[PDB]
Amino acid sequence: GPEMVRGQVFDVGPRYTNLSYIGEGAYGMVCSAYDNVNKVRVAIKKISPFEHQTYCQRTLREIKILLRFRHENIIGINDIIRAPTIEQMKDVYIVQDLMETDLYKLLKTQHLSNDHICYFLYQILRGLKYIHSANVLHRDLKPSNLLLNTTCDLKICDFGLARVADPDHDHTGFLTEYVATRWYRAPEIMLNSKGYTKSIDIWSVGCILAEMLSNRPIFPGKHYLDQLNHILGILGSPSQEDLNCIINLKARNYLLSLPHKNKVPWNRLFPNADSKALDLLDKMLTFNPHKRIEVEQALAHPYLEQYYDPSDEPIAEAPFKFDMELDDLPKEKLKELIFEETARFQPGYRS
Ligand SMILES: COc1cc2nc(NC(=O)c3csc(COc4ccc(F)cc4)n3)sc2cc1OC
Ligand SMILES: Nc1ncnc2c1c(I)cn2[C@@H]1O[C@H](CO)[C@@H](O)[C@H]1O
């Protein structure tokens, strides 16, 4: 029904009231509201994607995945409010639990103790273990996608770029997909356009760990070649065999033309960090995806030994499946599927 706030309209309510602007997401404003059903404050994502096909893909993907996932380190969807008629629907409001902050903003104001870092990492990898067990790739793990309520309450969010894992799905379309925010993008994405393996999420987590240890991003490239420059500057010039799985024969070039850099020792870059953290970091930031540590091995690393508990780390009941590949569907078809997926939150949804 009613409502406004900062000039924009928020067709939330009567249920949701006492609004209060929060900030900006992708294609939408984001306030907090009071849920008059649940008698607590919640976050409401106002999304306007239907203009561009790509924005509708991401919006669709996030709904399908979050509605199927259930895990305490992964944000849920509590309520989806949209218009009654498909033609009259031009906004979508996604209602989710209200979180105090996210890792990105927290790292702007605080240096994290080893302890706190340790249990943040544990909660990231516990959530990641459920995601990968569902055969799903997040593909955009980074601090602003880690929502935080306390040192003991971390939730992964924003599954807009997620995919079902397809260790074979190749396409080598370097301009055809947006895979990971640049600073957190694994080398095999940039060198082989190989963005459908679980290794890419582990890389990102490694970038997030490095960032927790120093309050700055470890690889802040301006563009993708500068990104590779920052990686080789700490990892050192690659081997022949790491240069073996560089499928793009032209991608070779800017690397071969490089001045042999030495591997910077982790403890030199992070003199104050726990050596156990620095050893796990080493396993996560391996250039070659095939030697990089997997999520269950990361959880079992000695650095997480205080918390690792396979009996309290849920996995998915069944692999997740996109019943249709929506890579190339017109944005009017996607808007249809969105209208459908959000049907369960409308009066009279049968079945
Ligand atoms: C979310 O708000 C809070 C923030 C917060 N930050 C804290 N940091 C320290 O106490 C603290 C004590 S030694 C230290 C330095 O660590 C390292 C480790 C490795 C490295 F390579 C560089 C540095 N850091 S404790 C804390 C509690 C908060 O809420 C209860
Ligand atoms: N559930 C939530 N609780 C708090 N903040 C959230 C969310 C969601 I989902 C997204 N955001 C966005 O991330 C930032 C939080 O610091 C904010 O800028 C906001 O854009």
Side-chain angles (χ1 to χ4, degrees):
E3 296 301 12
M4 64 276 286
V5 92
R6 302 278 146 102
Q8 256 243 91
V9 80
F10 248 73
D11 204 303
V12 320
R15 170 165 176 183
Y16 305 98
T17 80
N18 308 31
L19 274 61
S20 169
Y21 179 94
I22 281 180
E24 285 296 344
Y27 0 86
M29 189 173 175
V30 173
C31 309
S32 61
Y34 183 73
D35 186 332
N36 287 313
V37 176
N38 292 329
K39 321 266 191 184
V40 287
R41 287 199 70 83
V42 293
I44 306 198
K45 217 159 71 178
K46 199 268 200 70
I47 291 214
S48 318
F50 307 107
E51 230 71 69
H52 209 281
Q53 197 263 2
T54 280
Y55 291 175
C56 301
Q57 282 194 228
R58 296 162 182 191
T59 298
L60 179 47
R61 303 187 108 106
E62 187 184 16
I63 287 156
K64 291 181 97 292
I65 284 160
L66 296 188
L67 255 45
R68 191 166 308 183
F69 281 3
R70 193 175 157 124
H71 190 286
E72 62 184 20
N73 304 113
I74 299 172
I75 199 69
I77 291 162
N78 305 342
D79 191 14
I80 300 170
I81 40 216
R82 77 182 161 52
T85 62
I86 186 164
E87 326 115 86
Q88 191 192 11
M89 174 186 63
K90 197 127 289 183
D91 301 328
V92 186
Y93 306 72
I94 305 294
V95 183
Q96 294 169 296
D97 300 332
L98 173 64
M99 305 294 295
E100 193 169 320
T101 194
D102 58 56
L103 191 55
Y104 173 83
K105 297 154 68 192
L106 177 60
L107 294 177
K108 288 306 124 115
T109 33
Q110 208 90 81
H111 268 271
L112 294 177
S113 60
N114 187 49
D115 281 332
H116 288 176
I117 290 176
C118 186
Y119 192 58
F120 279 152
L121 183 60
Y122 177 77
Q123 300 180 71
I124 297 164
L125 292 164
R126 178 175 189 268
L128 191 49
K129 161 173 176 176
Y130 178 94
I131 296 162
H132 286 181
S133 82
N135 198 40
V136 168
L137 308 179
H138 187 281
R139 318 213 305 174
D140 197 24
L141 293 165
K142 62 182 176 165
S144 62
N145 289 337
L146 299 180
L147 300 175
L148 311 167
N149 258 331
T150 82
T151 61
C152 290
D153 179 13
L154 175 158
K155 294 176 186 294
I156 301 162
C157 73
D158 190 8
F159 286 69
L161 305 186
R163 292 293 190 283
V164 173
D166 199 349
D168 352 9
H169 182 335
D170 192 5
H171 69 102
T172 295
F174 282 92
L175 259 9
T176 66
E177 280 176 14
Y178 182 73
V179 193
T181 307
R182 185 191 324 115
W183 297 346
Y184 308 92
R185 183 177 298 147
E188 60 275 16
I189 295 164
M190 298 182 282
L191 297 166
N192 305 334
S193 203
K194 189 266 283 231
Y196 285 81
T197 54
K198 289 162 177 177
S199 54
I200 74 170
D201 283 339
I202 298 296
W203 182 272
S204 298
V205 171
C207 292
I208 290 169
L209 173 59
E211 199 162 332
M212 284 191 296
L213 295 168
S214 85
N215 282 66
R216 78 218 157 213
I218 183 183
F219 303 132
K222 297 170 177 166
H223 57 46
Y224 102 80
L225 294 179
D226 189 42
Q227 196 63 33
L228 291 175
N229 234 98
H230 279 72
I231 294 166
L232 293 215
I234 298 174
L235 268 45
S237 302
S239 69
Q240 291 302 327
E241 171 182 30
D242 299 340
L243 291 158
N244 258 337
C245 53
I246 284 187
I247 279 17
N248 186 257
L249 318 155
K250 172 149 32 226
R252 204 54 138 203
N253 254 352
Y254 179 89
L255 287 186
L256 281 52
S257 14
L258 91 317
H260 183 282
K261 317 185 213 51
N262 276 342
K263 161 171 203 59
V264 179
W266 292 113
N267 61 3
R268 214 92 68 71
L269 184 38
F270 305 108
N272 308 278
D274 178 323
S275 73
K276 289 191 203 295
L278 282 188
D279 176 67
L280 177 53
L281 180 55
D282 187 79
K283 315 293 217 310
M284 304 188 307
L285 298 186
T286 82
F287 185 89
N288 187 289
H290 305 295
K291 66 207 206 280
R292 188 175 307 140
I293 191 175
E294 288 146 317
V295 64
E296 188 76 21
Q297 307 170 322
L299 276 168
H301 196 274
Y303 184 54
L304 284 3
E305 70 204 346
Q306 308 165 271
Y307 304 112
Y308 182 43
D309 181 4
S311 91
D312 194 32
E313 291 158 11
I315 71 190
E317 289 202 45
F320 174 96
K321 270 291 77 217
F322 283 118
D323 37 310
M324 331 257 178
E325 246 310 60
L326 9 65
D327 271 309
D328 53 329
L329 285 41
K331 62 172 164 170
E332 304 76 24
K333 178 66 171 184
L334 294 175
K335 173 161 174 166
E336 266 170 39
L337 310 158
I338 294 190
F339 186 84
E340 302 186 356
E341 203 77 5
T342 55
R344 31 178 306 181
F345 297 95
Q346 303 311 300
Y349 169 69
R350 216 65 243 205
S351 291

